[PDB]
Fold magainin 2.
Amino acid sequence: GIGKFLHSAKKFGKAFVGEIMNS
C-alpha cells in the first residue's frame, strides 16, 4: 500500500517533528 505507508510517513512524521520540537 503505497498510500497508507505514505499516510503513516506523515503522522509518524508529525510525531517526529514533535520529538525534535521537544526532545
Q: What stands out?
A: Helices lie at 4-21. The chain is about 80% helix and 0% strand.
